[PDB]
Amino acid sequence: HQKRLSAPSHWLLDKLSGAYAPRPSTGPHKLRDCMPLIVFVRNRLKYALNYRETKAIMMQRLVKVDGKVRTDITYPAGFMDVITIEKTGENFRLIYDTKGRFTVHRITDEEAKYKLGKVKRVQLGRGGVPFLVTHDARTIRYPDPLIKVNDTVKIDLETGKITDFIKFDTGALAMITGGRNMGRVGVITHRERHDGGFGIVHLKDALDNTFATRESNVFVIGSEKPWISLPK
Amino acid sequence: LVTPQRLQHKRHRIALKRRQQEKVKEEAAEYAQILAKRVAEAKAQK
Amino acid sequence: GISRDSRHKRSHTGAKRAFYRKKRAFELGRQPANTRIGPKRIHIVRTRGGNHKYRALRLDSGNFAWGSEGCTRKTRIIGVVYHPSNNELVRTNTLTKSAVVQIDAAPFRQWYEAHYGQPLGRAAHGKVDPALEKQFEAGRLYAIISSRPGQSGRADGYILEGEELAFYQRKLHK
Amino acid sequence: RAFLKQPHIFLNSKVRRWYKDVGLGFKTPKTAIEGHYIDKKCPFTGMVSIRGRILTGRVVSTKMHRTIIIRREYLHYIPKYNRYEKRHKNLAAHVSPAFRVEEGDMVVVGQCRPLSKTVRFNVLRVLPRTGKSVKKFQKF
Amino acid sequence: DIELQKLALKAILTWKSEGIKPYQEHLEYLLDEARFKNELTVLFQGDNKILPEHRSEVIPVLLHLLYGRAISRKGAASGRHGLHATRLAIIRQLDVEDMGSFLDIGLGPLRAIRVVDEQGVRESVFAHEPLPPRKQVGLLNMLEAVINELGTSVEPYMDALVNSVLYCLVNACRKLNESLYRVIRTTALKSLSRLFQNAPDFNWVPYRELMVKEIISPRIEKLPVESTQGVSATWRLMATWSSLPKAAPFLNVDKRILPKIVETLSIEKAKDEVKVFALDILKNLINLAQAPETESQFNELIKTELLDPNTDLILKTIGGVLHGQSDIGRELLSSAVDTVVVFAPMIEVSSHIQDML
Amino acid sequence: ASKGRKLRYTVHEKLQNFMAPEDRRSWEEHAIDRLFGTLFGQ
């Protein structure tokens, strides 16, 4: 029941969708780190028109988010989730622009089959078992032992297994997913530890603009290796 | 009333059980050979 | 009316304040348990997140640890010996946390003569400290409750040995 | 009373002293290492965790049961005067017996969980200086 | 059956006796499945312990019900905490005369059994079975709990204990349907080992051929090749024989036993624990060889029949392990150097003192 | 000084007029004051 004006600005909405905006259901992604599926399909991608329209389309099993059908209308689709629609036969990834607003990449199954998920935390579970928690809140039993925090992992999304990983590297191109300079594509060139809390990295763009960003909100994409096709 | 469908559901339950357990066996064995390879490369650097 | 708040107290400057807000459900204080000697009288209560804790009020047997040699057994409770907080608790014989209490010696002596075999309280690895052997020939040792009987429903703890043993025996003599 | 004891280190055995670092480039003093005082509220001895805020300052009161008070002065900017105005504060921290305690010294203190109404803090380093009584004044 | 037991108890109380009268509520609370352990510790170490006057009147019914409750499988959990800790606490809290009557009710057909006669082996007895292997493994669990919770006090029942367990072992080694008999063998071995270190003064001498049939037939020609993985319960009984002075005369029976032990020592593919186990066995042998009169009753037996015919082989194997491999455990080093330190005053003449220096 | 351990002789305002004194007594007071006279001592 929140207002369209209280709706965050990185998911876009015009002046004519009524005063209210729907609140996202709880899930893997965070509240303000979400674009709801209805906002995707009918408010950003305009494939349906009405609430009940979107509702009916999701009641029938036509869309699968990250390889799995999703039926709840306000499911959290936060960042680089792949969305297949088999009727048009088109898949979509959710990234930012340089302006820090949501952007959608049309894509086929060839690049759509995997996900570059950012590691949150590795642990030793019950039975002493090593498991992995990524940014998508997905856990992986028995990962490869080298992948610690601040690494990303190419994930199979059909078996969901590890397919690759990129190490946290001052020298790797990264992406900004938070803060005042949110959504700036550039290379990590330095990192300052700040032991005692809230350490940062120094990251310049491709066109000589260096800025200090927190290792919390950083997100690596590849050293060069554009493993997800950014739109030109 | 025991129906053959219900018996099949019991079979399906225990089949998913044994399938889960053998999958844990496979991932444990492959993780074991992976970590052996990794520590071999580590001490090879050493 | 019982709670845990700070609105009724004074500041660091010594000044009091009204700041009157109504007492709320996350400020809850619950009535204590006087866990005393009796048969098993334990209630169960759901709490924040519906989580159940066991309020024991009358308890007969607790599990105590002869862990310097490697066992722990569920023995009966005789009565409290000393409480570091309050002589009134010692008077009414209540079981709290860290409470030195006399217990029986029969299953411990049975385990000693079952593993080592040497009769006790009547080669070199079987060795009892002499004050503990005095407790053994008394048939009633001194253990201590290290569990919360009100907040776990049970009296678990360890036998009293050596330095703390002589310390609390001297305190008994005090 | 009761017996002071490290809670989970087995002493009455026939066949150790647990002291942890706080990290953050601090050194556990030898009195905290092997000094046979045991206090649950010392960082190296007890099981309390330092995190969050690190501070320092000058004691005004050493004479209390393991509790000093730091007078925190600062130059508050009054816009009406367009000036910096001295405002002293009063702080609270638990004193370990590990350190040698001086009056008027510059003492380094880090933040742990609240141990009383007032104390949320623990000494981590002491700098022995010749600071005078409350007549003295310095931004710190 | 719990329902059978409850109607049984109702007819027991239909027998109106003043002995059973003041404990009937305790019997009912024992049979009530929700208060078993706590009713047991109400019975024992409570205010209402059993009066020794009518104790004779109350013992048979309570021992019978307690047997039935230790046997019943329904409410038991899995693992050891399913019913094993129950039997553990039962025999921990029972009495020794109560233990005699308890083993009396526990042994149905093997209560009156004879395994040794004026001859050596009662093959006419051994070529028959009164029992299925389920009740046999249950018997062995019961007697293992008996021996472990009793300790020394197993002396006045030995003439039944050793007969029962040794019949089960000899039926097992005859049968070597394999799992039941293998586990019969293993738990009988461990219970006999605890029995050996529980009763020192007992005459184990009226039988030797039983130990021969247990040891020399299945394992001796394969013992190092099998125990290159780990210590077996045969090694456990050999170690308790090496520790007990009166069980050490059971090693001179076959003269190749210590050759196979030292061959296990010589095999370098062992996992070093069976190696230090063999070191401990020969260490206890030399400790008996240097111990005073209480062990000098059998010193001259072990000095001449065991140690003297194998000194050169001992030095050969220890030199093979001390010069062959490039890796050696430090515990292995300390244990082996201690064994040869204590073995040096045992020998006077040998053949490999050059190798040893 | 501490919590309640000192008898602060403070007049308690609601605790002030609880119950009126009810003299329910059966004898004539001369029996008992002679009785307290020649108790054990006399």
Place this chain on the structure above:
RNA sequence: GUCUAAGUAUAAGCAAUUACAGCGAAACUGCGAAUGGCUCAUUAAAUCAGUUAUCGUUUAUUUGAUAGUACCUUACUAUGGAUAACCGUGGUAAUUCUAGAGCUAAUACAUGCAAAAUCCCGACUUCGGAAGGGAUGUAUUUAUUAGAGCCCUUCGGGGCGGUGAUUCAUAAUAACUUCUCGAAUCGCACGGCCUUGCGCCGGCGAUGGUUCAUUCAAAUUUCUGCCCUAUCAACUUUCGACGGCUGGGUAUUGGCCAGCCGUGGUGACAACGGGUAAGGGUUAGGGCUCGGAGAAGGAGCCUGAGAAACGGCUACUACAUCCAAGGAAGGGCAGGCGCGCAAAUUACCCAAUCCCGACACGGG
């Protein structure tokens, strides 16, 4: 209030060509109602704001995974009972008043026995695949343990889990529990082996389960910032005022409370007292956004993941309704007048946006 293929249908309910079949009133079950808003004495860094921290805490719902736990003296053998709704006999003057008598189901509450099973090891090995060696979950509590340059040389060369930090994570042992869980569920497709066995294996979901996440919350906590006033300089210790030790409860830290003693703590850098006049972010601008007490009155109790709901119960008080006089239920806002003379709909729909539920439909 709440229905989907996927809970329980014998409505003596409808509609038809063989336990059941479709539609499906009723009833049980599960979900809901931590809000929509109404009244009125206020809240002067205590809220609040930035800014931390939880290595001090609880979390229905989200999705992600997620359970090696046999045998263990019975020698024998896919389970229970209720009850609703339903049928009938009534009572009273009677309200969600209900008595007697007779039924039946569960995803409602309840118990729960084939010489194999499953791990770790493996000697020998033809990748053979294996002799045979050891061993038998989870939740609770306590104790213990673990938590791992130098020299030779051809001068080319050769050789010698995480945090800043934790008793953290994790593992095992000893016992412990009136201690749990480890599917006695529903629907749909129906195939391989052919012992054609009321066969053995076989897929897709719904419902349910332990733990950890994660979301959503909730809960403390750190530095700073209040407006004015000294006709406010002493104040706190007057429910401790400050410690530190020990216990209790709390989800947890905490004089938060109970025992022990110590001495405080604040203030002329403005304590304390008085007064009531109760802002923040979105920056060309203006705009735009966010912002305490009660449900007739005190006192006690009850559900739930979350309330001390104001939802209920109980007492006391105080009204006040019907009555056949014996009894029985119950306490809101809105409106019109407020001199006898005056002035804005008693409109309609959830169509859009948004919200809640067994749930595409129902309700807002």
